Design a binder for this molecule. Structure first.
Ligand code: PLM
Length: 288
């Protein structure tokens, strides 16, 4: 038996982890109506993308990995002797990448494809990749790994803050009054992931208090977990995420694993500027 683990680009794993474990990545893309295209990778400048988003009078569109990017990587790993491929995708409730990875697995002969719906995104989804890789080293078969990841999914979630109200109306999800009235009070919509979908949770005035709301809600949940891994997932507001990150280091015990990360263009294309989230996993994920 020879098991491999791959994922899509929205897992936002560091290039250090990608290189160390030779993780293959099927990238997503974001295409402005300028015709400008950004294929997600650890090479494009995230600052250039945020500048084009502010300059673009229309919101861009994101695309799942094309049914083909999966196929070549499936063919490449099978050639290298891999008998089973575990594919970790972002939430099927917000993207079709999970479906494309499954359908492409039906067209590649001579290798078993085990597509997994993480029901999340960013480094929270990447935690499923690092848990699968760890289990392969310990001698687990793919079915035990899928069952473990399915159990892990039961104690995994995330809350997030929306900051760019201008980006919301450019997409049409809010009005002009609500956009205008919202920025003057500085109302921050707080949302959370639930069964792979993003649903409204609270509406909080000022970003500082919404960050404190993220901390209280997540901490109240992970108190009951035997193992805890917390992930600050920040946008382009460096000071916002660092404040929450350092606040967690002071308020949480060392038994909690607390880490910091940032999301890429595909997530930024939907969140806009100033996005910030707090994810959690009920496990002690190996981040090295
Ligand atoms: C703390 C973890 C969560 C951080 C915030 C993540 C919110 C994600 C927003 C929606 C992204 C949609 C991606 C669609 C991809 C596609 O085109 O198939």
């Amino acid at each position: 038996m020879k098991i491999a683990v791959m994922t899509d680009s929205t897992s936002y794993l560091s290039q250090d982890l990608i290189d160390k474990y030779n993780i293959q990545i099927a990238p997503l893309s974001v295409t402005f109506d300028d015709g400008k295209n950004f294929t997600e990778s650890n090479e494009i400048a995230i600052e250039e993308f945020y500048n084009k988003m502010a300059s673009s009078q229309t919101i861009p569109t994101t695309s799942q990995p094309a049914i083909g990017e999966w196929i070549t990587k499936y063919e490449m790993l099978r050639d290298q002797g891999y008998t089973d491929i575990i594919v970790i995708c972002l939430s099927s409730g917000i993207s079709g990448s999970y479906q494309s990875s499954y359908q492409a697995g039906e067209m590649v002969e001579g290798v078993n494809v085990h597509a997994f719906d993480s029901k999340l995104i960013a480094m929270i989804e990447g935690c499923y990749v690092l848990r699968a890789i760890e289990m392969v080293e310990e001698g687990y078969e793919p079915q035990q790994i899928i069952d473990d990841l399915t159990n892990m999914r039961e104690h995994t979630g995330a809350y997030l803050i929306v900051d760019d109200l201008k980006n919301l109306q450019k997409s049409g999800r809010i009005t002009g009054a609500q956009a205008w009235v919202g920025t003057l009070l500085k109302m921050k919509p707080v949302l959370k992931f639930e069964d792979g979908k993003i649903i409204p949770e609270e509406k909080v005035r000022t970003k500082k208090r919404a960050i404190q709301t993220l901390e209280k809600k997540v901490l109240d949940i992970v108190k009951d977990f035997e193992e805890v891994t917390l992930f600050v997932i920040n946008g382009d507001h460096f000071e916002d995420g660092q404040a929450l990150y350092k606040k967690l280091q002071d308020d949480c015990p060392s038994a909690y694993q607390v880490a910091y990360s940032e999301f890429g263009p595909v997530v930024a294309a939907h969140l806009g500027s100033g996005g910030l989230g707090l994810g959690y996993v009920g496990r002690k994920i190996r981040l090295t």
